[model samples]
Target chain A: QGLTEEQRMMIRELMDAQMKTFDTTFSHFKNFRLPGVLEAAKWSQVRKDLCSLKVSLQLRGEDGSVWNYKPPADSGGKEIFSLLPHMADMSTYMFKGIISFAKVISYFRDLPIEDQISLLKGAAFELCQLRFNTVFNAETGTWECGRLSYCLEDTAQQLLLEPMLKFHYMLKKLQLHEEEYVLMQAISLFSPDRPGVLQHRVVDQLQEQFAITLKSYIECNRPQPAHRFLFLKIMAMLTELRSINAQHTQRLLRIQDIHPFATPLMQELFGITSLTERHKILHRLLQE
Target chain B: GLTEEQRMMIRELMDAQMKTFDTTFSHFKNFRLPGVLSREEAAKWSQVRKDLCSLKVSLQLRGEDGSVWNYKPPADSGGKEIFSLLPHMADMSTYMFKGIISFAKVISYFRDLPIEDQISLLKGAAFELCQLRFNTVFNAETGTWECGRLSYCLEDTAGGFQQLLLEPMLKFHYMLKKLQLHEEEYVLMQAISLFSPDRPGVLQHRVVDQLQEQFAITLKSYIECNRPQPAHRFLFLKIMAMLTELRSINAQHTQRLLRIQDIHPFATPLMQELFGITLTERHKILHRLLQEGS
Candidate 1:
């Protein structure tokens, strides 16, 4: 009820865009997600068991497309945060990220529904940083979001963002594969220690599996022993992401204070009532 | 070369990665490479050998392959009193299997490969990995994978195959031991050995090859990062060179097992898998155990 004609208009536009992108994510193969296909591989659990409970929608093996579940983004279509700017105004990206991130959570096989939302709510801000980080251009100090680039200054807060900037640029310079970022996203999402998670051991175990996969990529790919330690280094990035998420909360709250109606989507996704309540009704259902 | 932030970041990263590596290292650290200890050396080991033997706390096995037995002595009764070696050698390798499960499970890249690919890599390179793990305990002076908790000699673990298999095996083990490997180097080597893209039946060739290559580079870089220039001299060459030698030993391990199975029971499920026997069953057990409840 709090949503304006304008807010309602943007919602439908992002929904259309999300539907189109979701199709491409898992479009190519229909069979792999089925129970028995990997059973033929024997141990249906082997293929069904993803290292990350929260897997990346933006990655595909050559066979990932063949197998159906790996679901990479279409070219130039990496994620909701980046992709929504292609479809509508930049403000919609936050809602798109929330919806898209929720979409990914729903695909996490059979996590306890409560733990799933715990991860989503706790992880939303950090996931936003990880997704936006792909477009982070170190030299210019700007995020190259679709169609337009925005500096950290645009979002508010410059000083707290310095370490985040260095972290962003430094990690990008690691020359990580797209799959690496996807793994990082999963690692961030499955935090056992997230605020409301009831299943600490399960979530912790899942986090370790995903973290090992990321480290595996670094170990299996990065040639420099200099990079051999990169696994630990990027893990430090999680700590840094936590720091950045803290600043992110402050910045979003600032935006709400000064320009209340400017980005109603973030106001909801990040939460209050009214706009947030309507969002839970429309999108949170998609998560569970 | 690390920066101030990265140096700090890396310090903590090492904190965790090294923590796991150290934690896992502690598990296998109890193993000693086997060799003929001196009378001086033998007395201490020989005494501990008898002490454990006297406690009558012998090694036990209740394996899935249905071959269940126990070591009668830390002196290792197989080759010492008994002539048959399969159960004894199988006993040694079975210990290797018990502890080595975590490495593969923790091995993130290995986890990514298809189930069959993982099995093929293990079945193909497992003996080499087992052999490499064995080298860590090598005495160089006494050649001690044979010494520590459950001491065995070359004669003890693979006596009959000594000339064909153990000779080369000793040579490779001694060579690796001589390089004076860091725990990390030994680790990277095992990972590299496990990830042979060209291994027979390996389906995911490119990723596996790339996976193999990283450990290769990591070893080189690890050396470059840690060792001085003198240490760098031909160590990479020697390291890579030993891999060829390792393959030779692994081939012979298989050859030895091919016969070793004839005169004696082929051992247990885990040992059979290394010797290249029933795989789906081996993989099933491995996947189940390593599901570490994943």
Candidate 2:
């Protein structure tokens, strides 16, 4: 079943295109870790690298047939195509950031606006658990998820519950004001539904079913208020944005939602915020 | 190392263990492609049989102490002895599930089985899976979480397929459904067969549009309705029971498995019921399974 010259050429072109896509995808896929500085410079660099990879792949594909030679039986092509491993790694990190950001926002968003600012400071400190877990790669990675004994639930346990318990302990120690205490206490009402369950609160069941003690049970349910609230909010936001077609109004709304939280100082910490006047204005009075 | 008799003995034991595990796991692992089986029923059955017979083997070569040949079941043990073996078996079972589920083209394999066989195998797999160990940890010669224990934790061999195979395979299926990439229908069906084969309302989607839909609801419903679920809940109870030696209730989960046919249509629901078996019951079941009581 020899290929005609035209077919061979087409196959070669397709392979070239596929590799191009892989390189482009891989570049963006590589640098997406969570809990690091939220600077703009690093992200910009990442974006630039992504562009370069995309262009390089495209340039190669635009040329003469590159797949002229047959691959050996042991060619690394199969491993190359198994980008799922790498993608899984990136996703685990992305998920950590996504979950954390969603969680922090959810905490305040669930409270009346009056209670939010006070809780926000303490929430930021609690968010540091992501930093702690990041050191141990406790943040889920396909490498961790698939290669270790940690299943999705285990990953959830380590990433969610441990930090939560620590946060609860910290809150009690800080002896924050009564209002803050109430806000912290409020988290107990929401239950983080298990992975496959949406909008269902079975915290009581989880505690009883897993033999989790009554002492820890109330705290376990606390982390859910922030998680579920933020999850639904983001989904609703996305749905609203979808019908608008990458438009100005939707983009503005997106910017507004993210902008207040995305102070240029946070960008500076991440190194992506340029030392420009516009960014400085955005960070005005918020800088440490 | 130099004895011919030892080598023969090892080979014989390995073959027997392999056969027993394969046969035992196979009873539960058989599945069918939902809609396709309603037509071409006989051909489907033949294909499924071939598929099951072809399911490959990867071994768990170590024993409780991290040694190569110490696979003694924990039954005859004294209290301490019973506690000792449970962790290792618990860990080993997790690895076995991982290895079996990672077989490539498993979807095509199931689609070929007859509907009845599919249902039967799914039930078997559910119960077998329910009998798995999820949360327990083992203690080693170096002390828990010490040097040897730490190193063991890091090894590919230590975790085996529990991590290397199962999570990614499941994620791959989930990702395929969520991303709506090509072949979404076949892949989605494969996922359903693996996770929710007998559930009625779960629809098969095209592979391309797979990712563009909701999965949590479907998966939840499947679990609620499915006959033989991921025995995680029962296995959890069983693990606790064995660790604590709850003499009275250990047989509960095993007894629960016998009613699989008369239970809900999907496997997960039946599996979830085993969670109700008290921790003490779990201990008794493990005690018997390991033959330690005598």
Candidate 3:
């Protein structure tokens, strides 16, 4: 690889600038304290500005690489090149996780106890895994192994795990319960790697559990009803995950077991007995 | 919020059907187990195993109720209901069970081999498991999840045992290998998940550091390659940056970002670096890109 002096200088300058900006962003947050309302607001504003700038720079840089650089095209269109946009602008992409969080949070506050539970299930359905290709090595052509990564995996894991790890964190900050926390974790844990299978049993169990628990919580707080759009956002997350799964399956995993019925239909058989079990215990006619 | 009665009815019907399947499937699976034990004991164990498995399957089946029976727009969404929604949906057809039979044969071949060979065979199975599509279930309606394809798990179809045993291991392998590639898409996805919209945490910071190192190294190598001289070379680097950034933004928007007319402000500096020109030049380049596409 041959590089000119000018290109080297340009890169050096870019890094230096980014570093300065990063330092500035961090400095704004240095003084913020717990429950430090004033400092937190300022810090958030500064961080958002820097992130916006970072994304803008990244986009322009990537466009330049695609237009000007040409490699000795070999390996049937699969070539490793220095397209750096995904990395530089990564901190700013927010459609999936944010939407999901918003949806879940809305449900936590407002919807009736029952709606809250079912709606949360609907929201979890919206989360989908996004996959990216990671090939082995940059050198001499020998295809070894590659894997997929999801956009929502880390977000769901963090949100769910953080709460499960410490109930105090939720109470002090988010004001959520241990069960709500666990439900979120269970949802992520159950997210299917591939598209199509709806794994309803997990959703139903979680929904039922959430409703039972949330009902008790509502007796105290009187939370408001959540909006439907928020629930839709979560669905969007699931949609993205599904799309990624489908694309990856096409590209990487060509062979898979095909089931004719969606897993939910298969679930129907189990529900009836559980329904009866519930009725026998209650000694009343079950609904519908 | 409204229909407890209806919900309960659906539950009752669904559970009844599930019980029948569970009994049949459990019996079938138990029938295939080792024969070293006594017949009576095996039958008793089989009954127990069926009961346990039934419970497990029932628990897992909770998540599958979204689109069953295509219960119309007002109805709740579940896997099967979504399938039923398709207007031209076909009668449920089974695949040539031959694929499973063949798969079984492959498993048997590996199981009979020596330990080392068996491990080697397991590796192959793992690889195939990574890609195997047991079958494609399609509907003539909207061709989305309607036609099942092969990946690791069928989010809509796989039984509880298949999901718990297979999906995570496959995902682990999938994620681990991707991180190795220094894939910007995965890296960005990971970064967004870790960092707040504006707040960068330790994990997010680490991701940034890794990406910067990777970008610099890859660019350095590209520059050394027998390509061209300074200005174009600079442009080439910018081009790479733009491409990567485009993907990141695209990933953010899931393919719709490109259609948006406005470009992000951050894209400017890198654009200038690539062209060895100013921000003004980037405007012209953007104009050209738009024109070329049009």
Candidate 4:
């Protein structure tokens, strides 16, 4: 009864929120009238398309990777790259997922074909690291993909492994909901500012839309009214994801020098010397 | 994959937070902060300095309404009169009482908790918030606070308290003042200090932790939106550092306030109340809240 203006205001905000909240499923989009929309509705339709595209993608992917991954027993120092074959298979599967993922993104369909390949090139490994996070068990420092548990501390270079574990631990602390993890993947892929994308402004706009939507989701859906800078922290994660990727390539190159442990797709993604040479290889993979 | 239901929840949640945020922002804009007052303005505040009685003995005083007037000083006075001890004690008492209410009444999070929890939080955070509020007026060059008309030299006012409490406080205020925080940042810092979940006696620690997290988020957003043009990239990190420094001062304050009660038992009722909840062991009501759960 001793309600200060503070709680009273909150009471109303809660009520208004409960009554006014609602959204449309992506499935409804295919049935909508397909043409002759005005400029504003064009954007509205495009955004709906991207949002639904993610909804469709996660439905396929989360259920897609549900098999056990047992690590080989001690093979001396060979354990560091012991799972290289498994990783090659895993990396190829994810790369295939990205190609399929790219097709549904309506904007990418019209993007210069070269532009489409370049976006995939920048995002492929970053998205891979993010996808791995879904199964990472930070408490035990393991990636329990499907049923068989794999320790990050094992089968990875100490330099790269430590950072990977640290990064995994921090994100897990956020207790990200399923939707957040998917949106993070979407935002990582649409990074407008990358090494070789041409339509920077267009890509930038799409990224911003998803980011705002993601931020909106965090603000509205969390248990408390007070935000703990979830958006800032997640955005920072994107930055760190790039840093981790950059290091992965450096470490991979070092491993390549020691003994070429890169699988066929790994070799395709990174198996090279110098930046200019790799761009030559990447251009044709998505050329079709 | 977020369903349409989830999207609407996001949309509505964003709206709910912004409404609360904008109102707080608007209210903050109206504050006439005395911290940065002109010398011309500060000179006039000097008059009230004389109204305070000099250090002689700890005095029993009625509150502003003056109904229950009577008098007593502690029996242990010279077990230490470590210089103007009672005077600074009596002086800061006025500021603490006024600062805490002004802080509590304006902020809505205070009453949103159960009445039981409000007492726990207020008891826990009052002193830390008081130091934060005081730092707003801190003048780094002269090492003084020109709060309204009263000029408190750092050396004289904090009871010549040094080593733990005084040394770290100066360092904290120096860094905090360097941020030159807008009023919004200032209020947000106070809120962050108040809603701490780690404070020892908080039973609803998770709820308070969420509140603290929420404000920290607000602080980061406020900096990003408002302070974007600068290369203040690590400003949020720097501000969070001071929050740790504030804990160091609270521990010292806990020890020293207990010392004051030891040497000079006759304190204002408000001082007794704050200490009972936060720093006391034997105070009757201090155990009341802890026992309620038991």
Candidate 5:
């Protein structure tokens, strides 16, 4: 309430600047119409096979049941070997669109090589989830992934589907506008504490500024209770987004162990160098 | 190589960072169970209680018969234990994270890294460093913590949601206890783990490598002059190897936490963020914890 004229102007300017990038990214997904039923049927088959492979690999539990069935101790190498290429292909395809969308943020280019890699590692999956939910149709309660529209629970990874759907369901409840998605993506990208940042305090300050601008924008547009509620809901959504990102990391790490020959990109993203190194790292851990 | 003055400065900075953490989290020391506190005590301690509760800290306690009970306040106020020990465990975790963050803030070299790199380094290393802190404060002989300020049978705490972590963590402590590591060595190991060169996306890896080397050298000389044995030459490598093991356990710990989140949606936002518990159901869970408690 006591904001100076200049402070108000700064908020406006920052929102405008963020919108330019947000708009560019948003357009990339805006044209993702629901796929034809036949195409969806085809993709569903593909998803089915992928899910089967994932279950066989033991990366996920069979048929969405949660259990603690530890794999045979000796089966690690063979299992991972069987699963590596499939996972690489699946992950690469899933992330390709978001990768290009991320490139729109000009500040990303300015980050050091290490910081760039680190931020990508921390944020890419969350960004993917954000984009997926953006195209989500609340009334239909469906997600358009690639050339198919599927129920929220129809993900290839069974273990992840429940949580993912739950997250999207909550997001749908929030009824976020198009611009808010962009802002959320930006907030995620510019995360101040993504593991290897050198200028965390600086980044923290920038995120704070963006957050203030977002709050001011919402306050200006919506009624009092709704705006405050929406703001908290979105904040909670980010927390959910991050939790999913962590789940993704755990999945990748499991895949990395079973399939030692992970692609360089996979290795980098999951923070592993090689299977041998990973083994030596854990060689001293207590045996079963 | 860092000059003697630089080494001294690093030590001072580390101490200062630890000091700030202790100051910030000291209030949690006396935290009681929500059920145990009187209405006035609950009201008075409401802020700290809320802070501890929101952390979703595990409150594991050991019985005289060596059974472990995870204290969840009964709907009634007549629970056997006067206070819950979960707050202590939660407080300790909060303290560890705050300490690591403070340590990063105080180190000029760490502060100078790009924000992305800082976050990456912290993410990759914070948990392992926290484990080191856990090992240092853990009293393996008595199976207590903080020299009996919090006493529990280690075997008792080794069950349930954290069973996967407890064994490796205890094994690590036992290994280090055998080494009889000095205070200086523990401090240096914390720094070494913090500046981990192998952490993915470490841009200034050469610099981190250099910092690790300098500390290794410092530990080497300290060991040589004070507790010298030819076998002790391998102490540095052994410590380094322990770090690798720590990382391995950390990965398992992450997976275990994720699995726990799936079944029980009660982890705090801080726990969720640090452990990567991103399930949306946690909102409902948190709402329930708050509603059920005072």
Candidate 6:
């Protein structure tokens, strides 16, 4: 409020520069085209490779031979590790996307080192969810990543799948525009109120700038009460995205205890340096 | 970056405010009633006495008899002396609020904001600012407040007057004591909380942003100069985090008071607005309550 002409110009220029990069990154996903017959066959091959990679990483016997593993006659081997191959792809894409997103907002680098790390920790999961449903074909109720179509029961553990499905349904119901999605991602990334952030005022101003931009875009492009309602609903959905992330992290922690060597990336991402510190984060989440 | 003397100057600035509050309110300590008075003088005394009784309830002031000062006159004498006590306590709360605003105005950067922006920032941050001031009075080891005048274990003050805030406030003070917060650090933090840019409806956001940055920079230099440990670089950030947690506790207490107000209806309009008992705040309160329940 009380922004001078120069400051207003800077905010507009920054938003335009960031949106250029955002559009380019989003187009990368849009251009991932796959045709019918051969693409389906190729998807089958990828799943087989991912499955083999998962089995290769499982715990081995003391003698160094691959541990003998068996499956029940009627039941498929649907252990949590079965989902890791898909997770590896999802996690890699999400991590790279976040890095690119951070680069667009150049001032992010100027923040204090601790603030940078804290914001990443707080926003990582929610940002992942922002794009988590890009592959989902809502009409069919299945995730169509390339030619591989994953039914909920086949890809995700029930505990993990339920919230994602619920959120995806909500996202579909709202019919959010591409521009709105990009702005929401930026808003989610620049959150200033995360527990340990040091330069919160900087983050707060950045978020407010993005919010004002989003508001103006909505007012111009949409009509009536629906625009304001949609804006508030989008904000509400971000909070739900956070809760979903917390649940996902909790599940990953449980999986890590048993499958400690599952994925180095997951380990590094979720790892807290100290057990007490991890407990403190969990305690803070409970209080929230 | 700040030198040792510069840090000391900021501490003195804060101490000066506390001195003003003490000097302005201390007159009530000697207030007593005369044996006889003219009818007009007596009527004035009666009005003053009623104001004092309300002030005691509003400020939660404790009396020497180990109870809150109530309106019931004592058998031995009329309530003339208690009437004099009212203006003093009223002046104390007023001075405390005014003293903080005056301290904020002294910062050249903060004074530059539009007057409405200044008022909004002060309204949102005053409770937090006062809590930082009150931190100096808390005695962690003895579990007492205000230099042993009020004990946490005592039912009269802790149990009755400050039941909503005593536990959380004591916990916060104990943590600060454990951290060995210097007077300079406390002053810097109070300033940091005061110029917080995120307070809703702040018009001059950039000015508030600059003021907070200045305080943080000063605090960083003060810490670097005083502490030998290299890890203490993060010490300021950690304390800021503690203030965030303290703010959450403040919100919780406000919600509790709002719920209490539903039944008792004792809070003044100023208190209701300052503590955020409004429709907008109700939506937030309800949102958090539902979140907690879920």
* TM-score per candidate: 0.38, 0.21, 0.16, 0.36, 0.37, 0.37
What candidate 1 gets wrong by more than 4 Å, as runs, is A1-288, B2-85, B146-148, B154-166, B229-231, B278-283
lDDT of 5 by residue, A31-79 (tens): 3222122345544333333342232221222366432222222332243
- What is the C-alpha local distance difference test score of candidate 2? 0.29
Candidate 5's C-alpha lDDT?
0.55
Q: Model 3 segments beyond 4 Å from truth?
A: A1-77, A81-182, A191-236, A252-288, B1-294
Give candidate 5's total backbone clashes.
Answer: 26
Candidate 5 vs candidate 6: which has greater DockQ? Answer: 6
**The best candidate in terms of TM-score:** 1
- Model 2, B178-239: lDDT tens digits are 22222222222223333433232223323312321222223322233432322221221222
> For model 3, how does the per-residue alpha-carbon lDDT over A17-129 read when each residue is reduced to its tens digit?
22222211111212211111124554434332222111111111223442122222224221211112222122112112222332333223333333322332233322211
TM-score (chain B only), all candidates? 0.68, 0.22, 0.19, 0.61, 0.65, 0.61
lDDT of 3 by residue, B185-220 (tens): 222222222122122112233443443354344433
Q: Please state the i-RMS of candidate 1.
A: 25.3
**Candidate 6: segments with Cα more than 4 A from true spot:** A1-288, B1-95, B147-167, B229-233, B268-273, B276-294
Q: What is the docking quality class of candidate 3? A: incorrect
> For model 3, what is the alpha-carbon lDDT of residue A288?
11
TM-score of chain A of each: 0.59, 0.20, 0.23, 0.64, 0.60, 0.65
Query: Least lDDT summed over 10 consecutive residues: which range in candidate 4 chain B?
Result: B28-37
- Compose the digit string of candidate 5's lDDT tens values, residues B201-270: 5788888888777766776565556654423434654676676787897786666545434433445455
The docking category that best describes candidate 1 is incorrect
